[PDB]
């Protein structure tokens, strides 16, 4: 019926894909082996749209692992649930990326493309109707950012009326992996902005600090970012999981929260937050849960939303409050804080409540809106990829490759273009 | 015989639907089942159940609706209920794609695939009915597929059958609460087919049933079972006088036709009485007169707008339970000399007397109580335009740099469409006005 | 008597601003004026001289041969 | 348009009074 | 006179259309009769009427209309009767437009 | 005592009241303009309104032969 294809790419988005996958097995009752040891009631008949049915009732796993290097394979396959995907998936090469997105487009991203999209289309082909397809990813290499935008517009191509949704990750200055990495978000962000629907933004430094500072974690790693975003997006994906009162779909939330092609990037947020002692010390309710979801501190982005407006706004909750304090808290929200949001586009904030609530935790809600704070991070990325095209330095790497330097004119060009356009929409004055 | 055939369009309308059937089987002592099993202790059932109900040659009750949804999700939550041996999966048809609050898809890329099946299935429904009425189309604004369906589905009807009667059940955007962003969007176009297109139209919010039951229902935490209860007690009360008999019989078409005193005007303004809890309708003497001044109160509307800016042109009461006619009498000399409330020059006088036995009837775990008689309003007057003037305004600040319009172009819809939706509300309200103006 | 007088303009004040809102409601219902006629005659407008230009070339370069 | 907005209009053309009231009481303070 | 005139106008059921109000039966239970209404009830329409009196002859009954202590009257200055009367013009009208002076009469 | 407090509080009047004066202000001119704008539009009706009346001229001139 209403299934979703799941992608990888990127080591980081592979690692992060498993994650997503051990959380919802987990979650819906499923053993390591393959078998089925649930004890729910909604957790058999949508349980298809991430699993496909087969003998014995083993639900299997329905995702491509895209990669480069092998050796992530090997270490994604020794895991407690690695045993359990199809191994068909794991397309890997034979040569690395090096970090290189033009190197890994151009060279290994030609033998290998075919394997994958014979398999995706054997895939969607397997179903009989589809929505649309979920890729997670990074844009810290040529493994997550080479390869995952060439597959994207490849499916756009190919399926034109299907979802193209991604949580890739955004650099940060202050915190970095790459070299390169300036000239890979510069060119991976083109990609995002004209052959993509949505993009969700992924920030690791502002993750550290949140748990840092508010979950007061002992020896912070990867495995709880991952796991953060994995309750992220199944937050995010309950509403068509777990039907409720007031169900939603990707493609609404995509329409209602896109004022223009242009402008398609988001910022999520989960609302509970807090230390191991203090959990057993907590009230559950919704003025607390409003001021977690509304608050900056909470929201998982390195920058400030309070220096700009807020566009749109999505509230996604899961549980069994009700509906009437959502309605009160954002209309005392829009009467007080009125120097927050655009004046001229009144009720800007969007009503979801999940009835269905998640395993192992009560109240669940997720924040999923579009604020004015990702101007002073594309404004950075351009301020240092100019910089960095003044003098021409790293680039002999990708002029030996073939590509000439003319894209990164256009793309920079592009680049201040979106800019610009975002500044002078950041001002949406009423009129003259 | 005064036989109908109810419409539920949307999660909203198929939710209502529900409600209003429940309602009926428990007042009629309909059993779940589908059969009579009330073998050892009887507890009533021997009426006229044939105006909703079909009777079989086993027994058996069939209900006589329409459960269309574009998203199944809404369907499956039905099925997998305690009621699911009463209908038949036929009548409940589930979808590929919704449109969840977008109106060009539901009506051209959506609703558009769907017709034959259901035109086929009300062909046969009317068949298997004897004497035709009214319709009773149950939808919302908001939702996308209650809007862009509904209009489709209802247009073609229009035109298939112009004897019958036309009524409309949904509910309204709230001014100052709201579930979505698009609503007014699709507003705009549902209301111009749901004007030029039908006979009567019903507008109801839920901002106004929130204010009731925190007034006087006095809950903290309320939630939607109550708002369907209270929409089911008002349809029941509406269509009271055809599943039964009283001293003053007022039939769909005798209130229908003097409920629209033009063309253009036929938005009424629907109020229950009494709607309160079980504790307040013990210590609480109830006589015809206090309730129907309550029911001109503004706090009991469920129209927020204060009826004192204009004034009544039409006027309908209908009463259920046991009223005496003398009390009537003493509340419409009452009103009638009221300074407080407002008439135009030209009608002194109009309204029904709808008498009914039968008193309305309780729900276990409900919040209604025991009711000696009740009483419900159905007035005309200039006051409630305001709300579409403030739905042009919204829709007007919307439309001035196109906001989330590019959707609906790319879908494929005429431009001029929204042009088109704005004169003809704005010459709506003009004629609004010019009808409010007395000499 | 100073803090009197204080008191005194104080008040004033409330109530010359409780009483200018009604004018920003004034200059609402203004701007709603605005509203009835500025874009659907303004839309109506262009696209009736469009549709003018178009049938007036056709039906000339039509008599014309 | 009404006496809202004939008051509306004198408070205007006195806004100049009304001004010079403010900043009379300000520097007073 | 006045006020009790405008009050009921402005209120119910002290001045409603009483020629359909019903009557009660008591006594004991049921061994008696039903109680009866018989006063303005039948649609009597009684005009208003006033009384002051004259100069001279107040004098001679032993003042020339003197005002009581000006600090006593907080009632007859009372914001609430005040606001009334800025309120309640159209029934003030609506009731008597013969306001009256009538202390220069005397012979 | 009396007479800070009154200040503080005529202090916090007064800032939201001059928050809303050059609203009002702006909103009143821009309002003028559009009024302006108002009648711009009025007058592309009139300059439309004289070319349909070149139209119906031309095309009885069409159809006269």
Request: charged share 15%; no cysteine.
């Given at each position: 019926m209403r299934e979703i294809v799941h992608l990888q790419a990127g080591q980081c988005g592979n690692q992060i894909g498993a994650k997503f996958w051990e959380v919802i097995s987990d979650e819906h009752g499923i053993?390591?082996?393959?078998?089925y040891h649930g004890d729910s009631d909604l957790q058999l008949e949508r349980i298809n749209v991430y699993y496909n049915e087969a003998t014995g009732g083993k639900y299997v796993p329905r995702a491509v692992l895209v990669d480069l290097e092998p050796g992530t394979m090997d270490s994604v396959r020794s895991g407690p649930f690695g045993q359990i995907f199809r191994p068909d998936n794991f397309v890997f090469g034979q040569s690395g990326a090096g970090n290189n997105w033009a190197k890994g487009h151009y060279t290994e991203g030609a033998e290998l493309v075919d394997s994958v999209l014979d398999v995706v289309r054997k895939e969607a082909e397997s179903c009989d109707c589809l929505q649309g397809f979920q890729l997670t990813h990074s844009l810290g290499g040529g493994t997550g950012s080479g390869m995952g935008t060439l597959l994207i517009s490849k499916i756009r191509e190919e399926y034109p009326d299907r979802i193209m949704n991604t949580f890739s990750v955004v650099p940060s200055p202050k915190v970095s992996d790459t070299v390169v990495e300036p000239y890979n978000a510069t060119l991976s962000v083109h990609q995002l902005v004209e052959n993509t629907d949505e993009t969700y933004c992924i920030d690791n430094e502002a993750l550290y600090d949140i748990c840092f500072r508010t979950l007061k974690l002992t020896t912070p790693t990867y495995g709880d970012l991952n796991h953060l975003v994995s309750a992220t997006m199944s937050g995010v994906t309950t509403c068509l999981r777990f039907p409720g009162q007031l169900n939603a779909d990707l493609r609404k939330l995509a329409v209602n929260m896109?004022?223009?092609?242009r402008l398609h990037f988001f910022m999520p947020g989960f609302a509970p937050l807090t230390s191991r002692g203090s959990q057993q010390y907590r009230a559950l309710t919704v003025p607390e849960l409003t001021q977690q979801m509304f608050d900056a501190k909470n929201m998982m982005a390195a920058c400030d939303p309070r220096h700009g407006r807020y566009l749109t706004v999505a509230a996604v909750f899961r549980g069994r409050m009700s509906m009437k304090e959502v309605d009160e808290q954002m209309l005392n929200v829009q009467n007080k804080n009125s120097s927050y949001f655009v004046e001229w586009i009144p009720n800007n904030v969007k009503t979801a409540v999940c009835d269905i609530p998640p395993r192992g935790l009560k109240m669940s809600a997720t924040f999923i809106g579009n604020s004015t704070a990702i101007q002073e991070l594309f404004k950075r990325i351009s301020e240092q990829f100019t910089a960095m095209f003044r003098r021409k330095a790293f680039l002999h790497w990708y002029t030996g490759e073939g590509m000439d330097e003319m894209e990164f004119t256009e793309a920079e060009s592009n680049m201040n273009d979106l800019v610009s356009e975002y500044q002078q929409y950041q001002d949406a004055t009423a009129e003259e | 015989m005064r036989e109908c055939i109810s419409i539920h369009v949307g999660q909203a309308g198929v939710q209502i639907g529900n409600a209003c059937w429940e309602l009926y089987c428990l007042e009629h002592g309909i059993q779940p089942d589908g059969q009579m099993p009330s073998d050892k202790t009887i507890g009533g059932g021997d009426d006229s159940f044939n105006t909703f109900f079909s009777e079989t040659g086993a027994g058996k009750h069939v209900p006589r609706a329409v459960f269309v949804d574009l998203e199944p999700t809404v369907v499956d939550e039905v099925r997998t209920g305690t009621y699911r041996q009463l209908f038949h999966p036929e009548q409940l048809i589930t979808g590929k794609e919704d449109a969840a609050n977008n109106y060009a898809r539901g009506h051209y890329t959506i609703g558009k695939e769907i017709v034959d099946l259901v035109l086929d299935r009300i062909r046969k429904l009317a068949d298997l009915c004897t004497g035709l009425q009214g319709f009773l189309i149950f939808h919302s604004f908001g939702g996308g597929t209650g809007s862009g369906f509904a209009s489709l589905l209802m247009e073609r009807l229009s035109v298939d059958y112009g004897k019958k009667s036309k009524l409309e059940f949904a509910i309204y955007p709230a001014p100052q609460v709201?579930?979505?962003?698009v609503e007014p969007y699709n507003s705009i176009l549902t209301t111009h087919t749901t004007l030029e297109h039908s006979d009567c139209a019903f507008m109801v919010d839920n901002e106004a049933i929130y204010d009731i039951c925190r007034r006087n229902?006095?809950?903290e935490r309320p939630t939607y079972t109550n708002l369907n209860r209270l929409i089911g007690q008002i349809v029941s009360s509406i269509t009271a006088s055809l599943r039964f008999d009283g001293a003053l019989n007022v039939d769909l078409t005798e209130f229908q036709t003097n409920l629209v005193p033009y063309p253009r005007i036929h938005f009424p303004l629907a109020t229950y009485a009494p709607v309160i809890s079980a504790e307040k309708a013990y210590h609480e003497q109830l006589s015809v007169a206090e309730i129907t001044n309550a029911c001109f109160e503004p706090a009991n509307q469920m129209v927020k707008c204060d009826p004192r800016h204009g004034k009544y042109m039409a006027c309908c009461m209908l009463y259920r339970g046991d009223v005496v006619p003398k009390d009537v009498n003493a509340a419409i000399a009452t009103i009638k000399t009221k300074r407080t409330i407002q008439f135009v020059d030209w009608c002194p006088t109009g309204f029904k007397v709808g008498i009914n036995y039968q008193p309305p009837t309780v729900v276990p775990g409900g919040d209604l109580a025991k009711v000696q008689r009740a009483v419900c309003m159905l007035s005309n007057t200039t006051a409630i335009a305001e709300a579409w003037a403030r739905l042009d305004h919204k829709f007007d600040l919307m439309y001035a740099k196109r906001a989330f319009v590019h959707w609906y172009v790319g879908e494929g819809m005429e431009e001029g469409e929204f042009s088109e939706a704005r004169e003809d509300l704005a010459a709506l309200e003009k004629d609004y006005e010019e009808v409010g103006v007395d000499s | 008597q100073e803090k009197n007088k204080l008191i005194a303009d104080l008040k004033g004040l409330k109530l010359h601003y409780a009483s200018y809102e009604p004018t920003i409601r004034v200059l609402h219902e203004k701007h709603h004026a605005l509203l009835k006629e500025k874009m659907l005659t303004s839309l109506e407008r262009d696209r009736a001289v469009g549709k003018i230009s178009g049938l007036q070339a056709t039906l000339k370069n039509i008599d014309m041969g | 348009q009404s006496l809202s907005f004939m008051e509306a209009l004198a408070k205007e053309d006195t806004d100049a009074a009304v001004q010079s009231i403010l900043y009379r009481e300000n520097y007073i303070m | 006179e006045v006020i009790d005139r405008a009050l009921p106008t402005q209120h119910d059921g002290k001045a409603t259309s009483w020629f359909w109000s019903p009557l009660e039966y008591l006594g004991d239970e049921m061994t008696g009769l039903l109680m009866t209404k018989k006063k303005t009830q039948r649609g009597l329409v009684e005009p208003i009427t006033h009384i002051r009196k004259p100069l001279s002859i107040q004098v001679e009954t032993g003042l020339p209309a003197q005002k009581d202590?000006?600090?006593?009257?907080t009632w007859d200055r009372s914001l609430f009767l005040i606001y009334r009367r800025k309120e309640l013009q159209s029934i003030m009208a609506e009731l008597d437009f013969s306001q009256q002076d009538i202390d220069g009469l005397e012979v």
């Open positions: 053993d390591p082996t393959g078998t896109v004022p223009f092609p | 709201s579930t979505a962003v229902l006095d809950i | - | - | 202590a000006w600090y006593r009257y």
